């Protein structure tokens, strides 16, 4: 027949799909951004304490850098100043996990082509669900820019 059976298995194993850098489909992210571009700790911002610290953007695993300069900057007043220094890592709020798996990958700026940039996400390993931290540092406590 077809319903009834004894053996079972289907076999559905496909290759790594890549995701159109264009036609790509935009997805929920939470990242926390400081406002002193700050790798320190989660305790500056978990998750559920404030909605100034993790913020949703509907951005793309196949971003690049720059993508996710906008999404952050767009949903974060604090970066749309010019010559803001923001340092995209990934870290997990206070979980079942050691804590040591928080680095950054790469920073951007509010309008300055940086190196990493023309990197994109999936490079940092960036999927779904994954936690984003990034550093914002203003222009007004920032030694490296253009002032003194």
């Given at each position: 027949?077809?319903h009834?059976?004894?053996?079972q298995?289907?076999?559905?194993k496909?290759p790594?799909?890549?995701?159109?850098?264009?036609?790509?489909?935009?997805?929920?992210?939470?990242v926390?951004?400081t406002?002193?571009?700050?790798?320190?700790?989660?305790?500056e911002?978990?998750?559920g304490?404030?909605?100034?610290?993790?913020?949703?953007i509907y951005?793309?695993?196949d971003?690049?850098l720059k993508?996710?300069?906008?999404?952050?900057?767009?949903?974060?007043?604090?970066?749309?100043k010019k010559?803001?220094?923001?340092?995209?890592a990934?870290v997990?709020?206070?979980?079942?996990?050691?804590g040591?798996?928080?680095?950054?990958?790469?920073?951007?700026?509010?309008?300055?082509?940086?190196?990493?940039?023309?990197?994109?996400?999936?490079?940092?390993?960036?999927?779904?669900?994954?936690?984003?931290?990034?550093?914002?540092?203003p222009?007004?406590?920032?030694?490296?820019?253009?002032?003194?």
């Amino acid at each position: 027949g077809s319903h009834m059976r004894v053996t079972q298995e289907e076999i559905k194993k496909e290759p790594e799909k890549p995701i159109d850098r264009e036609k790509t489909s935009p997805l929920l992210l939470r990242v926390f951004t400081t406002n002193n571009g700050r790798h320190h700790r989660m305790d500056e911002f978990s998750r559920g304490n404030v909605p100034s610290s993790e913020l949703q953007i509907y951005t793309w695993m196949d971003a690049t850098l720059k993508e996710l300069t906008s999404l952050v900057k767009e949903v974060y007043p604090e970066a749309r100043k010019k010559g803001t220094h923001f340092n995209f890592a990934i870290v997990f709020t206070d979980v079942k996990r050691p804590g040591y798996r928080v680095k950054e990958i790469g920073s951007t700026m509010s309008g300055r082509k940086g190196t990493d940039d023309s990197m994109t996400l999936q490079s940092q390993k960036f999927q779904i669900g994954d936690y984003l931290d990034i550093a914002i540092t203003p222009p007004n406590r920032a030694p490296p820019p253009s002032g003194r």
